[PDB]
Amino acid sequence: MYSFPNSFRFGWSQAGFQSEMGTPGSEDLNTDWYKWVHDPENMAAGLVSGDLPENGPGYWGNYKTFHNNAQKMGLKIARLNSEWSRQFPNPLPRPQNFDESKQDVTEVEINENELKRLDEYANKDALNHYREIFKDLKSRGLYFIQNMYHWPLPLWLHDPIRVRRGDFTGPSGWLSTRTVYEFARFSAYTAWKFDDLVDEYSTMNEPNVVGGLGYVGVKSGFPPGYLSFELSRRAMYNIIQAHARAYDGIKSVSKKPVGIIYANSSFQPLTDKDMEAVEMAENDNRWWFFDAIIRGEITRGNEKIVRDDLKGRLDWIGVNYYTRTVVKRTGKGYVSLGGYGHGCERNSVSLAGLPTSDFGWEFFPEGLYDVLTKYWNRYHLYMYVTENGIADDADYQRPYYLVSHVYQVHRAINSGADVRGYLHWSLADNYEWASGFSMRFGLLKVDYNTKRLYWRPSSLVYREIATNGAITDEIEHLNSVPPVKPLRH
């Protein structure tokens, strides 16, 4: 049988922007993302689906129903985030004792007096409502991982349209150290007010996707959608500093563990002679970032420095895994291959013959074992599988996907990796950014009209796993690939 450690917890992850809106009074118009998906030109260009967040699941108002269902499903841990924009919707006076021309931000002064003054600008209603949501979460015995940032930035810090047009004279988001500075303070502020409810903290969610899709993969429809290798590096550099500064800010107010959540992929060799391509890919997509916030090894400009203000700023690693990424060696570097991992046809099969989701992502459980063990053997920091799921409205593949990946986590634990939990990507369907509501990742189906929640069969399977703290014998057969004969090719 496949039983998990006694302290191991099964739960779910969720994002504010993707799930909060939907109920009357929940509208939040002050984020770059909100403006971004409402933009006429982005819609016309098809960069965004046309669906609007205002028509979401309504977690902001129906959180009790969400939590109650999670409880009935036997979940014991949850990771959510606070929307910076709801806390500080209005512009903060330009901070002094700060030079924006300075490339590095080695420290941000945070003390009670600063927090007290910052508190005067905060939206108490939003702050109080969050406390209510989290109190309900905790009163139900659920372990709580508080994440500080999940993509949207308050508009007074980033006007995505301005930047998309090539105008860099306004709020430029992660392109400005002003954002780094304010994020550190913001993180400290939240921890200062919610520490009594939080068990573990996370500074941000998938920072690599933010800078990657925002400035390079512009067809993905992510803000500011300005194509530039150089600005992408600047964004990633600043987000790395932001993390470190946020880590110190939180630690000034709390003793709780502080980690980060990253977007992962299992790099697989097309051929047995592509092993070196894998390592290269792992360095460019994984190691460089973590060696920076753990080893303090970073590269600003064209020199390989080691910043002490960055070294050791991490207590745990949040692993977000969905599928693999096949690569091939090409003289100089390497290349990712279409028809595998994230680059497949929707509701079809990959070049390898494995079923793909409604999003066109290939079914590849083993990849999760690879990533977990890889992270463990390199840094030996404990971790949580903070995200794992599948866009599958019909629920044809989710049962197999759920059981298979949970099994891989079990396998990684037996190899010695310290994995303390598994959080399925979402309890209920939500807003899939540029893709809209059509991509449904929930264990619970959402009727966007009534906002009513339904239990997909896989949620009943998950209840068995959470409830028994193991993959029971009766559902072991689901640790396999969804049969492709009955599915679309």
Residues acting as catalytic residues:
206, 387
Of 45 and 305, which has the nearer Cβ to its own copies?
Answer: 45
Give me the least distance between CB of 160 and its own copies, in Å please: 12
Contact status, residue 411 vs residue 430, Cβ threshold 8 Å: no
When binding is defined by CB under 8 A, the residue of 219, 271, 276, 305 that contacts its own copies is 219
Count of beta carbons in the 10 Å neighbourhood of residue 101: 5
Q: Which is nearer to its own copies, 46 or 141 (CB)?
A: 46
Q: Which of 116, 135, 380, 489 binds its own copies (CB under 8 A)?
A: 489
The identity of residue 400, as a single letter, is Y
Q: Is 448 in the site for its own copies (CB under 8 A)?
A: no
* Residue 475 interacting with its own copies (CB under 8 A): yes
Task: Give dist(CA 99, CA 91) in Å, integer.
Answer: 18
What are the structure tokens assigned to 218, written together?
């512009």
The yes or no reply on residue 347 touching its own copies (CB under 8 A) is: yes
Which pair of structure tokens corresponds to residue 353?
A: 């013959």
* 337 touches its own copies by CB under 8 A: no
> Does position 218 bind its own copies by CB under 8 A?
yes
Q: Give the CA dihedral 219, 225, 231, 232, nearest 10 degrees.
A: -50
Sole window of 35-43, 119-127, 189-197, 367-375 interacting with its own copies (rule: CB under 8 A): 35-43
Other CB atoms within 10 A of residue 483 CB: 11
Q: For residues 327 and 360, give the distance between their C-alpha atoms in angstroms, rounded to a whole number.
A: 18
If binding is defined by CB under 8 A, does position 41 make contact with its own copies? yes
Closest CA to 37 of 24, 13, 23, 54: 54
Q: How far, in Å, CA of 53 to CA of 25, rounded? A: 13
Q: How far is the CB of 451 from its own copies (least distance, A)?
A: 13
Q: Which is nearer to its own copies, 44 or 306 (CB)?
A: 44
Establish if 461 lies at the interface with its own copies (CB under 8 A). yes
Question: Least distance to its own copies from the beta carbon of 283, Å?
Answer: 17
Instruction: Pick the binder of its own copies from 104, 114, 455, 470 (CB under 8 A).
Output: 455
Q: How far is the CB of 368 from its own copies (least distance, A)?
A: 21
Contact flag: residue 453 with its own copies (CB under 8 A): yes
Q: Does position 100 bind its own copies by CB under 8 A?
A: no
d(CA 200, CA 322) in angstroms, rounded, equals 23
Q: Within 150-179, which residues bind its own copies (CB under 8 A)?
A: 164-167
Among 74, 217, 257, 296, binds its own copies (CB under 8 A): 217
Pick from 100, 299, 457, 467: which binds its own copies (CB under 8 A)?
457
306 binds its own copies (CB under 8 A): no
Radius of gyration of the chain (CA): 21
Residue 318 near residue 259, CB atoms below 8 Å: yes
Region from 113-121, 196-204, 283-291, 448-456 binding its own copies, contact rule CB under 8 A:
448-456
Q: How far is the CB of 375 from its own copies (least distance, A)?
A: 26
- Rule CB under 8 A: say whether 464 interacts with its own copies: yes
Asked whether the bond before 224 is cis by omega within 30 degrees of 0, the reply is yes
Q: Which stretch binds its own copies (CB under 8 A): 45-53, 57-65, 200-208, 362-370?
A: 45-53
We find the least distance from the C-beta atom of residue 41 to its own copies, in angstroms, to be 5
Residues 228-247 that bind its own copies (CB under 8 A): 228-229
Q: Does 486 bind its own copies (CB under 8 A)?
A: yes
If one asks whether residue 281 binds its own copies (CB under 8 A), the answer comes out as no
User: Phi and psi at residue 263, in whole multiples of 5°?
Assistant: -85, 115
- The footprint of its own copies on this chain (CB under 8 A) covers a number of residues equal to 52
Pairing state between β 383-387 and 470-471? unpaired
Q: List C-alpha distances in Å: 10 to 70, 201, 258, 444.
A: 10, 17, 20, 16
Least spacing, CB of residue 17 vs its own copies, in Å = 23
* Residues 362-421 interacting with its own copies (rule: CB under 8 A): 392-396, 399
Strands, E, within 39-85: which ranges?
77-81
**DSSP codes joined into one string, 137-193:** HHHTT-EEEEES--S--BGGGB-HHHHHTT--SS-BGGGSHHHHHHHHHHHHHHHHH
- What's the closest the beta carbon of residue 1 comes to its own copies, in angstroms? 13
Cα separation of 94 and 4, whole Å? 50
Question: Taking CB under 8 A as the rule, does residue 40 contact its own copies?
Answer: yes
Return the closest-CA partner of residue 310 out of 324, 328, 329, 291: 291
Beta carbons of 173 and 32 less than 8 angstroms apart: yes
Distance, CA of 50 to CA of 435 (rounded, Å): 9
Q: How is residue 183 written in tokens?
A: 């994020």
Contacting residues toward its own copies, per CB under 8 A = 40-42, 44-47, 164-167, 216-219, 225-229, 347, 358, 392-396, 399, 445, 447, 452-455, 457-458, 460-461, 464, 473-478, 482-483, 485-489
